[PDB]
């Protein structure tokens, strides 16, 4: 969050051209310094983490920036000037990070500052207290989910929450419904159900053929090739036929834009404004993750077609509905993706009030001075407030925020400290009687502890993660895309929609980016690149489902992983040569990292864990016989790493009744030591 996610926020911000002459302001580079305390008479000095606890201080670091200012009056000269290292505010610092005063110290120095060499770190010091951030769960984004609400007018529904690469405060969601069959009426009884859509920023439902024509594609031979990929299927074409009958009279682009443009946040009184209003809402709020530019609108058509092609498959009964609690559809918000969300809303709020100070000060035409425009109390007191009190919002917004984050570290016993820095939280209510978000799901194998959970009203709502579970941090999809195009992947534009029936649609991070005609050789080429870490980092997951005939790739942050042992034909890849040189790490410089980079272990996500065949122990499951299976793909290290922190101090836990192991894990957290 502090090396990349903060530099991008100020760099990708609109300048403030303002005005006769007019002025320029844009931000270039961000710096930080080590945490510092300003004495009573203005002499600075580095604060150590201990004084922050004793004197009820706050452990933070000052923040600077470079601003350049050019005046544009066409006065036969463009006068530019810059003020570098301008003060902005102060950011809290997580202890033992790369920006703390305790980074990379030895035990002889950690004891010299009165610090414990065993202290793990990973918490903030805010007004003397010690705060810890709880990872929040969240539904995965940029994918299509098909549910069935058995209470309302809809017989089926699709969803896709979109967000354009960490750059939007909201996330636009779009449904693609389908009305019920038993609609009591002597009119639509014969034609059938009509596919509907509920776009954002509009009041009324919209038929899909209308919103298709608003992108061009007025013809009905071109629309029905984005939605149906093979015309030898009469059963599906019959289902889409009664979708054209109601969108038959409105048969051109401009009148279509007026139809959707008539019902917005503002009903257009004139015509050109509606045709203008309907233009961007269908261009910057519809599927922003595909592309937000006004060009490349053939992609927004294919994806909207795939979203509808997938809704019909769920009605003919050819593919099963999606699961809400399947743990492969969830993401986790750590301290990174949480403080970055809170820093946007306070950097925009800092630019919104340089204008108000510039306009009031430039109408009198005197001059401009920026060091007096920056209100430094915006970022400092903004972060420090929400962290200290918990409500994830603003001070005047103590009613619209999500509460329960950022509670105080537990220091009763050393194993109650570790079990606090490793804790999840599902944001559903704390008294709802619905059992399906509380029961234990099959997909929690090896990534969340099965026994450790509190009783009372919060049963199954907070959970602790297992010992070897590892959460990903994120990366950029740029280097995989440049490799995919040079490995014979046809783009979407330069292809004919009839060469799509026997091809495997290739997704990357949620976006449809082409097709391919020989997938099985692409796959085991993508994999042997990751095994030895040339182009692709080790935390990307690559799924291939043979039946639905597609391939998915993920690179974002929040997916949960765990290492496994790679298995070839029927033998492990971990030979003895790796052990007798791994018991020597003290004076050999051979460690875990040299083990991943040699292709003997591998991180396996939850989604990827459905296309795998695991063996639980080598010497017993990989022997040729009349055998259960013969195509094992991975092997576990030790099956005892499926337990949390407080549940792995129980001797012989496989001999007790199950509710007993839950009580002790919530009871060894309050034992004196």
């Amino acid at each position: 969050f502090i090396q990349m996610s903060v530099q991008r926020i100020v760099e990708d911000a609109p300048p403030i051209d303002l005005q006769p002459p007019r002025y320029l302001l844009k931000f270039e580079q961000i710096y930080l310094s080590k945490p510092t305390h300003w004495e009573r008479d203005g002499a600075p000095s580095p604060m150590m983490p201990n004084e922050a606890r004793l004197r009820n201080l706050t452990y933070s670091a000052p923040l600077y920036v470079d601003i350049t200012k050019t005046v544009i009056k066409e006065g036969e000269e463009q006068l530019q000037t810059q003020h570098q290292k301008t003060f902005i505010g102060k950011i809290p610092i997580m202890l033992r990070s790369t920006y703390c005063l305790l980074n990379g110290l030895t035990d002889r120095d950690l004891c010299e500052l009165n610090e414990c060499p065993l202290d793990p770190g990973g918490y903030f010091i805010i007004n003397g207290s010690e705060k810890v951030l709880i990872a929040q769960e969240k539904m995965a984004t940029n994918t299509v989910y098909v549910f069935a609400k058995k209470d309302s007018k809809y017989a089926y529904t699709g969803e896709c929450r979109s967000c354009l690469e960490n750059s939007s405060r909201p996330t636009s969601t779009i449904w693609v419904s389908m009305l019920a069959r038993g609609g009591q009426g002597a009119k639509k009884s014969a034609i059938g159900q009509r596919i509907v859509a509920t776009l954002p920023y509009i009041k009324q439902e919209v038929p899909i053929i209308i919103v298709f024509r608003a992108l061009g594609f007025v013809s009905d031979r071109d629309i029905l090739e984005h939605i149906i990929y093979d015309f030898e299927d009469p059963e599906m074409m019959e289902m889409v036929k009664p979708s054209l009958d109601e969108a038959f009279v409105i048969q051109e682009q401009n009148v279509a834009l007026n139809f959707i443009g008539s019902r917005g946040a503002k009903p257009g009184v004139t015509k050109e404004k509606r045709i203008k209003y309907a233009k961007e809402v269908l261009q910057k709020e519809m599927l922003p993750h595909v592309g937000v530019s006004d060009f490349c609108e053939t992609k927004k058509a294919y994806f909207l077609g795939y979203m509808v092609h997938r809704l019909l498959l769920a009605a003919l009964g050819r593919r099963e509905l999606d699961d809400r609690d399947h743990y492969g559809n969830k993401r986790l918000d750590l301290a990174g993706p949480l403080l970055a969300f809170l820093f946007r809303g306070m950097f925009k709020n800092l630019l919104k009030e340089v204008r108000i100070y510039a306009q009031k000060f430039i109408d009198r035409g005197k001059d401009f001075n920026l060091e007096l425009a920056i209100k430094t109390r915006i970022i400092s007191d903004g972060l420090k407030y929400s962290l200290a009190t918990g409500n994830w919002g603003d001070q005047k917004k103590a009613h619209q925020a999500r509460a329960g984050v950022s509670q105080v570290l537990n220091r009763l016993t050393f194993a109650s400290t570790l079990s606090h820095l490793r804790r999840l939280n599902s944001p559903i209510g704390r008294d709802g009687k619905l059992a399906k978000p509380r029961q234990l799901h099959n997909t929690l194998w090896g990534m969340v502890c099965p026994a450790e959970t509190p009783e009372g009203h919060a049963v199954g709502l907070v959970k602790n993660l297992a010992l070897m579970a590892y959460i990903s941090v994120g990366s950029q999809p740029s280097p995989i895309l440049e490799f995919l195009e040079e490995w014979s992947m046809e783009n979407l534009e330069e292809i004919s929609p009839a060469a799509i029936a026997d091809a495997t649609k290739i997704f990357v991070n949620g976006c449809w980016v082409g097709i391919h005609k020989d997938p099985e050789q692409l796959m085991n080429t993508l994999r042997k690149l990751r095994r030895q870490m040339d182009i692709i980092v080790s935390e990307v997951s690559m799924i291939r489902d043979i039946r639905e005939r597609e391939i998915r790739i993920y690179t974002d942050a929040g997916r949960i992983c765990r290492p496994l042992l790679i298995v070839e034909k029927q033998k492990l890849l971990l030979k003895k040569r790796h052990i007798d040189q791994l018991k020597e790490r003290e004076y050999n410089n051979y460690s875990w990292q040299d083990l991943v980079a040699s292709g003997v272990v591998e991180y396996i996500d939850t989604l990827e864990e459905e296309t795998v065949m695991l063996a639980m122990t080598p010497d017993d499951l990989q022997e040729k016989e009349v055998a259960y299976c013969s195509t094992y793909t991975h092997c576990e290290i030790h099956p005892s790493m499926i337990l949390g922190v407080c549940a792995s101090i129980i001797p012989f836990p496989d001999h007790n009744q199950s509710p007993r192991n839950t009580y002790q894990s919530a009871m060894g957290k309050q034992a004196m030591g």
Partner: protein
């Protein structure tokens, strides 16, 4: 035949300048347009947008003899430039840069 038994070698040049910008004019094959039927054509930037960005308006065989609208492609040199290769009387090849891609479609 020479498509199976033909061997040759020609020089390629890429001139740093041209007397005219080079663009691509693309037609749907499915229409199978007889260019011979084009006695004349008019070609003007589209007026809905009331310049270099303007979509083209092509009027063939008179104002209503034949008419198409050309819409600019999103990109043309975003990763790889496109070149026009032309044969010269000296056998050597001449390469011309593609400035833009316009999509042309038929109009009732």
């Amino acid at each position: 035949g020479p498509s199976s038994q033909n061997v040759t070698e020609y020089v390629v040049r890429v001139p740093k300048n041209t007397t005219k910008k080079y663009n691509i004019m693309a037609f749907n094959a499915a229409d199978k347009v007889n260019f011979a039927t084009w006695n004349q054509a008019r070609l003007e930037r589209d007026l809905s947008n009331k310049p270099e960005d303007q979509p083209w308006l092509l009027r063939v065989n008179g104002k209503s003899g034949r008419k198409f609208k050309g819409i600019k492609k999103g990109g043309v040199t975003e990763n790889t430039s496109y070149y026009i290769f032309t044969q010269c009387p000296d056998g050597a090849f001449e390469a011309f840069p593609v400035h833009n891609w316009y999509n042309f479609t038929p109009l009732a």
